Amino acid sequence: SMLRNWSWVNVHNVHSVTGTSENVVLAGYVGLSRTHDYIMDTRSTPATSQ
Amino acid sequence: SMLRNWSWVNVHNVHSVTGTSENVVLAGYVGLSRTHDYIMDTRSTPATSQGRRLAAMFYYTNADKMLSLTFGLAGQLRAAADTTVAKFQICPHTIARAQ
Amino acid sequence: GYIMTDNDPLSDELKGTDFVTEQFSLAGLTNLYLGYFDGLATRLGIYDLRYTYSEYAECRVELHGIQRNFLTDRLDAFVSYKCLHPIMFEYYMCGANISG
Amino acid sequence: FDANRLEDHSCFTKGWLGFNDILLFPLTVDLFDRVVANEAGVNDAGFIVP
Amino acid sequence: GRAARSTVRMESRIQSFGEGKDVDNFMAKFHNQLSGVYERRSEGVANFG
Amino acid sequence: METVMAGLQKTVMNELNRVIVSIADVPKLPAHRIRNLIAVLAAVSKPNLG
């Protein structure tokens, strides 16, 4: 059942839908800004209506 | 076979192609400037399209082609040194008089 | 820096011609691909960040077919990287076609 | 340092009278858990030094 | 080589640069860009960066 | 929890130890559905999503 799903193919003919690869290293959410704003009651809830 | 190839000659009658000697010490490639500029922006190249063409020929070359290129330069420079020697009368007497 | 053709004697003869006169780089080739893909995908209302990430100092974007050995399967050298049928292209691109 | 040449001090350690001992007073716990940090095989929020 | 008399040497001298450039923020770029090849939290990637 | 917050220091990558997601109020969901998403949130961080 795995040969029938084209597991036999040359892996060099499989292209990403963008044609590119990617190495992402992004500074992310830590949560110190949101917890600080909650204690000061400035912006307690950050989730918007949308 | 070494004697038949004149291993016995005077090492002073053997003249460089240029009529000069040399001792060059010029500060060179380290690679910290090339690697620093890569981390700043990985989307550039240090190799220009003229250097990629020159690189291609060295892939596609044999010793015979390179030997004639440089054994022709050695003739060209030795004829320009022979002109300079004749012009300025460079002989052991003339160099010793300068010393 | 590789003359890759399906005809093995042809790539040996192309070394001594004006084929090697004009040159280009993988970095320059990639930078044109990301620039055009970003503008086109936006015009299709996608807004992908493959070009935004390429301009971050900790992120690198490369073409997908780089990890293969180009000296091996040279008989598929001139086959493009278009993946989907000429009709599934018209399905997405509102009747537009690129080949036929 | 003790006398290392001719039963006398060197050119550099001679005449050093010293001062009051340095007290490393951490204003944060970082210096405390970096000194006892064992960087051999564990993640421990430190460098991987083989 | 009995009559050569010419020598050539290359010096790998490095100088300092970037009077203000915040060393610690480049060291972050270096060990993040090269994380896909070399182990990011190591004493060699921090030293060479 | 207070044991966890005691060791919540900054690493050598100028990086916090963990990602903080502070919950003030809870979206209206069944309890079992809430427990299931905690399982997901514990596994989203692991390599290959656990």
How many residues would you count in chain D? Answer: 50
Q: B60 CB contacts (<8 Å, ≥6 apart)?
A: C15, C16, C20
Spatial separation of the C-alpha atoms in residues A34 and A47, rounded to whole Å: 11
As a whole number of Å, the end-to-end CA separation of chain D is 31
DSSP SS3 for F30: coil
Distance from CA of C37 to the nearest CA of B (A): 16
From the list C95, C94, C97, C98, the residue with the least C-alpha distance to C44 is C94
Q: Is D46 on the interface with E (CB under 8 A)?
A: yes
Spatial separation of the C-alpha atoms in residues C62 and B62, rounded to whole Å: 35
Spatial separation of the C-alpha atoms in residues A26 and C3, rounded to whole Å: 38
Q: Is F9 on the interface with D (CB under 8 A)?
A: yes
Spatial separation of the C-alpha atoms in residues E27 and E23, rounded to whole Å: 6
Contact E49, E26 (CB under 8 A): yes
Q: Is A12 on the interface with C (CB under 8 A)?
A: yes
∠ CA B40-B42-B45, rounded to 5°? 110
Which chain E residues touch F14 with a CB distance below 8 Å?
Answer: 24, 28
Q: How far is CA B36 from CA A1, A27, B3, in A?
A: 51, 22, 54
Return phi, psi of residue B63, to 5°. Answer: -60, -35
- CA D14: distance to chain centroid? 21
From the list C20, B49, C58, F8, the residue with the least C-alpha distance to C12 is C20
Contact A20, C63 (CB under 8 A): yes
Return phi, psi of residue C86, to 5°. Answer: -60, -15
Spatial separation of the C-alpha atoms in residues D27 and D32, rounded to whole Å: 10
From the list A24, E41, E20, D32, the residue with the least C-alpha distance to F15 is E41
Which chain E residues touch F13 with a CB distance below 8 Å?
Answer: 28, 31, 40-41
Spatial separation of the C-alpha atoms in residues C10 and C12, rounded to whole Å: 5
Distance from CA of E45 to the nearest CA of D (A): 10
- Greatest extent of chain B over all pairs of C-alpha atoms, in Å: 61
Q: D11 CB contacts (<8 Å, ≥6 apart)?
A: none
A44-48 contact pairs (CB < 8 A, 24+): A44/F24, A45/F24, A45/F25
F:6-25 residues touching chain E, CB 8 A cutoff: 12-14
Q: Is B66 left (phi over 0), alpha (psi -120 to 50) or beta?
A: alpha
- Greatest extent of chain C over all pairs of C-alpha atoms, in Å: 47
Tell me whether residue F30 is exposed, middle or buried, using C-beta atoms within 10 angstroms of its C-beta: 0 to 12, 13 to 18, 19 or more.
exposed
Which chain F residues touch E31 with a CB distance below 8 Å?
Answer: 13
Q: How many CB atoms lie within 10 A of CB B68?
A: 10
Which chain B residues touch C25 with a CB distance below 8 Å?
Answer: 45, 47, 49, 52
Spatial separation of the C-alpha atoms in residues D1 and D13, rounded to whole Å: 7
- CA A50: distance to chain centroid? 20
DSSP SS3 for E10: strand
Spatial separation of the C-alpha atoms in residues C70 and C5, rounded to whole Å: 10
Spatial separation of the C-alpha atoms in residues A12 and C83, rounded to whole Å: 12
Structure-block tokens of residue B64 = 């015979």
Q: Is E35 on the interface with F (CB under 8 A)?
A: no
Return phi, psi of residue D13, to 5°. Answer: -85, -5
Structure-block tokens of residue A5 = 């799903």
Per DSSP, C97 falls in state -
Spatial separation of the C-alpha atoms in residues E26 and E31, rounded to whole Å: 9
Per DSSP, C21 falls in state G
Q: Is E11 on the interface with D (CB under 8 A)?
A: no
Spatial separation of the C-alpha atoms in residues C56 and B43, rounded to whole Å: 11
Spatial separation of the C-alpha atoms in residues F14 and E32, rounded to whole Å: 12
Contact C81, A40 (CB under 8 A): no
From the list B74, F13, D15, C17, the residue with the least C-alpha distance to E30 is F13
Can you give the three-state secondary structure of chain D, one letter per residue?
CCCCECCECCCCCCCCCCCCCCCCCCCCCHHHHHHCCCCCCCCCCCCECC
Nearest-10 crossing angle of helices B32-40, E23-33: 80
CA atoms within 13 A on the CB side of C64: 14
Q: How many CB atoms lie within 10 A of CB D34?
A: 14
Q: How many CB atoms lie within 10 A of CB E40?
A: 19
Which chain E residues touch D48 with a CB distance below 8 Å?
Answer: 39, 41-43
Q: In Å, what resolution does this model reach?
A: 3.2
- Report DSSP letters for chain A, one per residue: --TTTTTTS-GGG---TTSB--B-------SHHHHHHHHTTSS-------
